[PDB]
Design an enzyme around this catalytic site. Structure first.
Site, PDB file in Angstrom:
ATOM      1  N   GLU A 130       5.283  -2.007  -0.913  1.00  0.00           N
ATOM      2  CA  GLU A 130       4.289  -0.931  -0.875  1.00  0.00           C
ATOM      3  C   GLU A 130       4.618   0.036   0.257  1.00  0.00           C
ATOM      4  OE1 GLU A 130       0.479  -3.496  -0.711  1.00  0.00           O
ATOM      5  OE2 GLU A 130       0.813  -3.045  -2.853  1.00  0.00           O
ATOM      6  N   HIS A 148       5.888  -1.730   3.297  1.00  0.00           N
ATOM      7  CA  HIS A 148       5.129  -2.960   3.509  1.00  0.00           C
ATOM      8  C   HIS A 148       5.345  -3.962   2.361  1.00  0.00           C
ATOM      9  CE1 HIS A 148       1.083  -4.671   2.221  1.00  0.00           C
ATOM     10  NE2 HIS A 148       1.374  -5.419   3.270  1.00  0.00           N
ATOM     11  N   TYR A 152      -3.020  -7.744  -7.448  1.00  0.00           N
ATOM     12  CA  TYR A 152      -3.063  -7.234  -6.083  1.00  0.00           C
ATOM     13  C   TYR A 152      -1.658  -6.931  -5.570  1.00  0.00           C
ATOM     14  CZ  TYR A 152      -4.837  -6.747  -1.295  1.00  0.00           C
ATOM     15  OH  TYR A 152      -5.167  -6.287  -0.037  1.00  0.00           O
ATOM     16  N   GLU A 205       0.908  -1.272  -6.314  1.00  0.00           N
ATOM     17  CA  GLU A 205       1.843  -0.168  -6.105  1.00  0.00           C
ATOM     18  C   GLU A 205       3.003  -0.184  -7.101  1.00  0.00           C
ATOM     19  OE1 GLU A 205       2.842   1.472  -2.430  1.00  0.00           O
ATOM     20  OE2 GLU A 205       0.753   1.479  -1.758  1.00  0.00           O
TER      21      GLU A 205
END
Lengths: 98, 96
Positions: free
Chosen positions: B36, B41, B80, B84
């Site tokens: 991400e 990240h 989750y 992205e």
């Protein structure tokens, strides 16, 4: 000549042969799937799409000596479907590239 | 000890990404970690086969990771970690 994509089968696999395949690192593969099939003589049905090009000797080193391996044919998804056709997957890892 | 964990790595080394990718397929029943990111990240989720606790996980994934026991469905943590949509590692299947 090394290729990137191999199919392979293993009739009547030992448990030490099963752990050799599951003990492979996730980074070896863009995509990896091996289903169990059959239980009157179970065989593994596996398709490997390596990151790097691999040579017969290297594909046998990784999967096992007793495996019957050859260059794969068809789409990634096509061999995924062939390998999961008895619906008992042992390993899946990655995602099917083009 | 738990079986299901979640982790982040802020701005993660190339040697840190290949340490995570080098892990055995046979350690996990499910495993997903997407990338991400302006400050990139690593967002992950590890559903091991054996029960593991902190010091085992941090020997596997990497010291500066931020780990803790997971909460939510496996297909919830999958959504989750792939929000992205740049996946680095998916291995196994999202369980019960």
């Amino acid at each position: 000549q090394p290729h990137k994509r191999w199919v392979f089968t293993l009739n009547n696999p030992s448990e030490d042969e099963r752990k050799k395949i599951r003990d492979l690192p996730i980074s070896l593969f863009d995509y990896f799937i091996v289903g169990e099939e059959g239980g009157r003589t179970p065989h593994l049905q596996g398709f490997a799409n390596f990151v790097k090009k691999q040579t017969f000797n290297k594909v046998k080193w990784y999967l096992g000596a007793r495996c019957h391996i050859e260059k794969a044919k068809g789409t990634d998804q096509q061999n995924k479907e062939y390998c999961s056709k008895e619906g008992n997957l042992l390993i899946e890892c990655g995602a099917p590239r083009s």
